[PDB]
């Protein structure tokens, strides 16, 4: 009983940050609720596809304007 009550007592949209980028791929951390193949939009108006979902970070392939991606950019 007491454990269930403690758990229930212990229990705005999310923005991820780019932790890695190279050769047309970026890895985005965070985004707990992203779905496989959701469109991600990066701050330079470039888009990514969120094609891989690791334990820590999303692997997102980038459509087109890859040069405009830097570590620490906000991903909506």
């Amino acid at each position: 009983x007491x454990x269930x009550x403690x758990x229930x007592x212990x229990x705005r949209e999310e923005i991820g940050t780019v932790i890695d980028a190279g050769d047309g791929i970026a890895h985005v951390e965070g985004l707990p609720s992203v779905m496989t193949q959701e469109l991600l939009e990066f701050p330079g108006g470039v888009l990514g596809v969120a094609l891989n979902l690791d334990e820590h970070s999303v692997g997102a392939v980038i459509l087109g304007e890859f040069e405009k991606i830097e570590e620490g950019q906000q991903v909506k």
Binding site: X3, X6, X7, X10
Partner: protein, 45 residues
Amino acid sequence: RFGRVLDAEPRLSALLSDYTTPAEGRVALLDKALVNQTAAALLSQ
């Protein structure tokens, strides 16, 4: 005794696995759920 409680409560033990979560809110939950004072201090350490 705490080990007995954590092993008998698999959902609480899993929710206690907090290294990827914010440890401060995890410790606050564990102190509010969890006596010998020094034992509970080691547990919070």
